[PDB]
Ligand binder design. Structure first.
Ligand SMILES: CCCCCCCCCCCCCCCCCC(=O)OC[C@H](COP(=O)(O)O)OC(=O)CCCCCCCCCCCCCCCCC
Ligand SMILES: CC(C)CCC[C@H](C)[C@H]1CC[C@H]2[C@H]3CC=C4C[C@@H](OC(=O)CCC(=O)O)CC[C@@]4(C)[C@@H]3CC[C@@]12C
Ligand SMILES: CC(C)CCC[C@H](C)[C@H]1CC[C@H]2[C@H]3CC=C4C[C@@H](OC(=O)CCC(=O)O)CC[C@@]4(C)[C@@H]3CC[C@@]12C
Ligand SMILES: N[C@@]1(C(=O)O)CCc2ccc(OCc3ccccc3-c3nc4ccccc4o3)cc2C1
Ligand SMILES: *[C@@H]1O[C@H](CO)[C@@H](O[C@@H]2O[C@H](CO)[C@@H](O)[C@H](O)[C@H]2NC(C)=O)[C@H](O)[C@H]1NC(C)=O
Ligand SMILES: *[C@@H]1O[C@H](CO)[C@@H](O[C@@H]2O[C@H](CO)[C@@H](O)[C@H](O)[C@H]2NC(C)=O)[C@H](O)[C@H]1NC(C)=O
Ligand SMILES: *[C@@H]1O[C@H](CO)[C@@H](O[C@@H]2O[C@H](CO)[C@@H](O)[C@H](O)[C@H]2NC(C)=O)[C@H](O)[C@H]1NC(C)=O
Ligand SMILES: *[C@@H]1O[C@H](CO)[C@@H](O[C@@H]2O[C@H](CO)[C@@H](O)[C@H](O)[C@H]2NC(C)=O)[C@H](O)[C@H]1NC(C)=O
Lengths: 471, 464
């Protein structure tokens, strides 16, 4: 009618046979093309591989633990009890820690066994109605509380060098009593002085897991050789065991790589605990240039990282006179240490380091945020590969998620990377370039993609490169 | 041979509800949390976008009863500003705005349909693309068959959307019914309320994606039964329902999950169903997949009727607006609005075409209401069945100018690229409409291909 025919002459012309055959053929062709595309989508969906099942993690698989040895040296004088511990539970939420290993708070006189009760709190830390208040206040912030039950924590021999099995029956009786009050785990330290240790640990593990499967039991030795550690872990295998296995080196990267790979190969790639001691700080073993390099390693290895209080600010008991090394004073502010008013600086405090974006606490917060979030660091797979003289380089990769490449230079002089990979399976091989998430030293652009053949490492530097699932 | 009005009052309520409630209540309740920080101000953002959409819908309801022609927001600009602005709106609404919206909603349908086969991983992209191209091709053939079949699809899936959202709301009510508070505390709901407002605007810009489509019944008037009663009655019944369901869904999202697991989630409804159901939690991805199935039907139904009316004014070729007799459906316009939607299956990242034309999408709604006020003080005697209380349009004009002013002072990067699309649409106007004295080299070829497509699809021209 406007630029075409009208109804009359159209139905006159376009009603002939042949013109009906064409439109019926085109309708049949449309529906055959639709049923071709549907079967194409089906055989594309079927020829997609699969994707893997999540390994049903616990709560201590998710982030780090935080050991608080002395409760008085954590806050200070006056408020050195369990009621004052409730005020710091948002600083602990800033660190994104998932657990809290409270020190031994029970009534221990001294080496008399009969005057040591594990069911009663010493009055210098508070009472039980303060303790369950702390527990309920920590449950609100998603923080679990672990209770250390080492009996003779005021003497020199922690398991009472006199009578042996009677002091273990009162641990067996205390596990049940404290588990109904609502604690989420236990810790026993110095079990190289415990007689029949591998027999008692299996009994306490079967008691603790017989309550719930959301329950932890940590053990601690001062041992450093692998065959003595493996003797404790051959009967029970869900046991977390902190020790001084990585303490020895403080040194070259080939030895640290051999220690980590030999442990992971000897234990059969189980869930382990990565640490440097059972109760001590990182500055007791490492010089101050290797703290950032070890913090990057302990957050990116396949296990639970366990730290002490003050490890995020680099607390040092040999930098201030008149403090015990087993319990230094936590430098919250500039008024924390009352003697010698001026020995404490501003970069040695919590609030003085929460302002610097290139501090030590600012590295801890970024790494602890990255660990508790990404699936390749939560339950990824470990693969270390060969590199230059003094490097430790490895890769985490879960299924199809964002992969991670950690490059650590323990040496004193700089060198290149030389990442001759040649060893990884096809799901995690290196691309020609990768991002940069983090570096332990200033002087690099955090976010811009480098390429992994002219990578240079300056002294004591560590890198956290990143790349996605591709060819 | 006309279009044979079929749309009831309840069918209009179904059209508006089914087009509005699509993907944005499932793939966006995070953006407002990541640029608002606190769960109180996010609810403030959702309520504010609700009030904004309600007042704009009331202005468009009284516009659509005043002028009363199909192709709303285009017919109004044609009656007010003339020929060239109406063509420029029609042109970039035919090129970019409708075929990107329909393809994005079809892709979200395909992804959340194939999600239960790939529970914690990524869906393969050429398997979701090829199902998104099946959804459009099936709905464009259902719409070409009949009109009442296309309105039965729409209210069946509009009932399915409401039964899928009511289950989430009652799952949240029994989560608050067992006495535990992860969020929604009295005094602990505002920690991290991002102030400055500078970052907020971006937010208000994120919560308005879920409210889009409220002006779609204005495209499909002249097909309602008794439109002077049944257009505003279908608008003021449909739209205050959505602003209530949209806050009772987000606060029920806030009872179960926390702010650290919501911001680390890419599918909030899937993480809701995983906690509240465990196994038999596959019904939540298939019910947010069927939510995006009824939003492509309601937007292919009105996009065809827009290009229908764009051809009756001479702004388009006349093969569009040719009704197939005895089916009484605009077949050559539905084929066009399907082919344009399937052409966007070559785009890799078209989610960022939203910032390209968000300024013009609100500039048209501002220009329509300026002309609405201008028509009242120029032709002050027409049959106005519903008149609006004024200073709600005065509020809406400067509110749309505030929403367009953040496109030029905060992110003016791609707006100059977007303006070149309109000014490249201008010579198309001149060549197509203005250039008369046409040579017979081209006009007879145009007649020959028009009669060829006419004999192929068996369509006759309109005629009162
Ligand atoms: C896809 C299959 C769908 C099935 C149904 C077939 C429908 C055909 C779809 C065609 C869609 C076209 C939409 C846009 C049309 C704009 C033009 C117009 O409005 O004309 C009205 C005008 C109305 O004609 P009437 O029907 O006689 O009133 O249409 C024409 O005269 C023919 C226009 C053909 C346009 C073909 C594409 C040309 C693109 C621009 C070419 C460059 C122009 C400038 C040259 C110098 C460049 C530097
Ligand atoms: C790119 C463009 C120009 C090509 C257009 C091709 C169309 C997509 C094809 C697909 C099927 C074809 C037609 C097949 C036969 C006709 C008649 C019609 O037959 C009936 O159902 C009416 C008979 C009855 O009511 O009993 C079905 C739809 C229609 C218009 C179809 C319209 C669309 C056609 C021309
Ligand atoms: C799960 C989803 C993604 C797959 C597709 C959903 C439905 C299975 C499809 C299949 C065919 C569709 C429709 C095809 C045409 C109509 C015919 C209609 O019957 C009529 O009233 C119109 C018949 C006429 O006018 O003569 C009722 C069912 C309906 C809506 C069908 C309902 C189901 C639809 C939407
Ligand atoms: N609210 C809906 C829902 O399902 O949530 C319901 C249906 C509907 C109808 C119209 C609409 O207008 C959006 C718009 C207007 C002017 C210029 C660009 C765009 C644009 N649409 C996009 C879609 C997906 C990705 C990017 C997009 O950019 C949005 C929605 C979504
Ligand atoms: C934990 O150890 C106890 C024994 O030390 C195991 O419990 C025994 O189970 C058998 C079989 O029912 C009973 O006949 C014994 O009386 C139980 N002894 C008890 C309760 O002291 C128990 O099976 C062990 N747990 C696991 C997981 O193996
Ligand atoms: C763990 O600490 C103890 C005490 O500091 C180390 O010395 C042992 O002390 C006990 C008595 O307390 C003796 O019975 C052992 O014979 C001592 N060990 C040796 C090797 O003489 C003990 O060596 C430390 N463990 C390690 C692995 O160094
Ligand atoms: C570490 O893994 C390697 C291989 O996975 C083990 O090395 C083999 O040990 C057997 C003896 O058990 C030798 O006969 C093979 O020659 C060794 N092969 C290689 C390639 O070294 C090794 O036993 C594992 N480490 C531990 C502590 O078990
Ligand atoms: C905190 O900052 C002070 C300076 O503000 C550091 O003191 C420097 O110490 C090194 C080595 O002891 C000296 O070589 C510098 O000369 C000192 N600086 C000045 C200005 O005298 C101090 O070491 C910093 N503390 C930490 C833990 O990094």
């Amino acid at each position: 009618k406007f630029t075409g025919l009208s109804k009359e002459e159209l139905l006159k012309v376009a009603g002939s046979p042949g013109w009906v055959r064409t439109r019926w053929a085109l309708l049949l062709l449309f529906w055959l093309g639709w049923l071709g595309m549907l079967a194409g989508a089906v055989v594309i969906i079927v020829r997609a591989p699969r994707c893997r099942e999540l390994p049903a993690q616990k709560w201590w698989h998710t982030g780090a633990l935080y050991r608080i040895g002395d409760l008085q040296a954590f806050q200070g004088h006056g408020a050195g009890n369990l009621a004052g511990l409730k005020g710091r539970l948002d600083y602990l939420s800033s660190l994104k820690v998932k657990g809290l290993v409270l020190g031994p708070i029970h009534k221990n006189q001294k080496d008399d066994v009969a005057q040591t009760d594990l069911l009663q709190i010493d009055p210098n830390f508070g009472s039980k109605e303060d303790f369950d208040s702390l527990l309920q206040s920590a449950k609100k912030k998603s923080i679990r509380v672990i209770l250390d039950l080492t009996p003779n924590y005021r003497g020199e021999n922690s398991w009472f060098s006199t009578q042996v099995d009677t002091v273990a029956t009162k641990v067996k009786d205390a596990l049940e009593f404290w588990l109904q009050a609502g604690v989420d785990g236990f810790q026993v330290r110095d079990i190289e002085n415990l007689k029949d240790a591998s027999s008692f640990l299996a009994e306490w593990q079967n008691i603790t897991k017989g309550f719930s499967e959301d329950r932890l039991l940590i053990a601690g030795t001062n041992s450093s050789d692998l065959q003595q550690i493996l003797s404790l872990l051959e009967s029970n295998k869900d046991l977390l065991l902190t020790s001084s296995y990585l303490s020895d080196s403080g040194s070259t990267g080939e030895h640290t790589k051999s220690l980590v790979t030999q442990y992971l190969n000897a234990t059969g790639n189980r869930w382990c605990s990565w640490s440097l001691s059972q109760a001590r700080l990182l500055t007791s073993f490492l010089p101050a240039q290797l703290l950032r390099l070890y913090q990057l390693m302990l957050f990116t290895l396949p296990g639970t990282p366990v730290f002490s209080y003050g490890d995020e600010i680099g607390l040092d008991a040999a930098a201030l006179p008149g403090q015990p090394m087993e319990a230094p004073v936590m430098l919250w502010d500039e008024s924390s240490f009352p003697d010698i008013p001026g020995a404490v600086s501003a970069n040695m405090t919590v609030k003085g380091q929460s302002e610097d974006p290139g501090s030590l606490l600012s590295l801890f917060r970024r790494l602890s945020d990255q660990r508790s979030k990404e699936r390749s660091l939560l339950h990824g797979d470990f693969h270390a590969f060969s590199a230059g003289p003094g490097l430790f380089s490895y890769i985490r990769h879960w299924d199809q998620n964002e992969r991670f490449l950690v490059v650590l230079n323990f040496g004193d002089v700089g060198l290149s990377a030389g990442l001759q990979a040649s060893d990884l399976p096809a799901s995690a091989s290196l691309p020609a370039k990768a991002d940069l998430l983090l570096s332990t030293q200033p002087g690099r652009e955090e976010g811009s993609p480098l390429e992994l053949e002219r990578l240079k490492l300056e002294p004591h530097e560590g890198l956290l490169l990143r790349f996605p699932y591709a060819a | 041979v006309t279009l044979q009005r079929n749309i009831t009052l309840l069918n209009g309520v179904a059209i508006i509800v089914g087009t509005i409630i699509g993907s944005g209540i499932f793939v966006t309740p995070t953006g407002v949390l990541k640029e608002a920080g606190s769960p109180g101000l996010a609810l403030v953002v959702w309520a504010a976008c609700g009030v904004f959409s309600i007042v704009g819908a009331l202005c468009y309801a009284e516009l659509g009863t005043t002028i009363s022609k199909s192709g709303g927001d285009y017919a109004y600009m044609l009656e007010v500003y003339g020929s060239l602005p109406a063509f420029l709106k029609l042109w970039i609404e035919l090129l970019i705005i409708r075929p990107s919206s329909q393809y994005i909603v079809a892709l979200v349908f395909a992804t959340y349909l194939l999600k239960p086969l790939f529970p914690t991983c990524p869906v393969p992209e050429e398997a979701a693309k090829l199902v998104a191209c099946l959804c459009v091709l099936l709905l464009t053939a259902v719409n070409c068959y009949s009109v009442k079949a296309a309105t039965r699809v729409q209210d069946a899936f509009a009932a399915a959307k409401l039964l899928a959202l009511a289950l989430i709301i009652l799952l949240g009510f029994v989560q608050i019914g067992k006495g535990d508070v992860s969020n929604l505390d009295p005094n602990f709901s505002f920690e991290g309320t991002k102030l400055d407002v500078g970052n907020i605007v971006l937010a208000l810009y994120s919560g308005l994606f879920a409210y889009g489509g409220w002006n779609y019944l204005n495209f499909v008037t002249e097909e309602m039964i008794n439109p002077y009663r049944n257009l505003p009655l279908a608008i003021i019944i449909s739209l205050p329902i959505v602003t209530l369901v949209y806050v009772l869904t987000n606060l029920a999202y806030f009872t179960t999950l926390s702010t650290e697991q919501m911001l680390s989630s890419e599918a909030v409804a899937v993480d809701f169903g995983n906690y509240h159901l465990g196994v038999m939690s596959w019904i939540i991805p298939v019910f947010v997949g069927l939510s995006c199935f009824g939003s492509v039907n309601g937007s292919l139904f009105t996009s065809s009727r827009l290009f229908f009316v764009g051809s009756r004014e001479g702004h388009l070729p006349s093969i569009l607006s040719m009704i197939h007799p005895q089916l009484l459906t605009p077949v050559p316009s539905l084929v066009f609005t399907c082919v344009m939607t399937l052409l966007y299956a070559f785009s890799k990242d078209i989610f960022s075409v939203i910032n390209f034309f968000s300024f013009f999408n609100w500039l048209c709604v501002a220009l329509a209401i300026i002309g609405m006020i201008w028509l009242r003080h120029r032709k002050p005697e027409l049959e106005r069945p519903i008149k609006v209380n004024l200073a709600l349009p005065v509020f809406f004009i400067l509110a749309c100018l505030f929403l367009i002013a953040v496109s030029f002072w905060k992110t003016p990067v791609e707006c100059g690229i977007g303006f070149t699309i309109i000014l490249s649409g201008l010579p198309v106007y001149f060549f197509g409409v203005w250039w008369k004295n046409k040579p017979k080299w081209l006009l007879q070829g145009i007649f020959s291909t028009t009669v060829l497509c006419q004999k192929l699809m068996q369509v006759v021209p309109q005629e009162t």
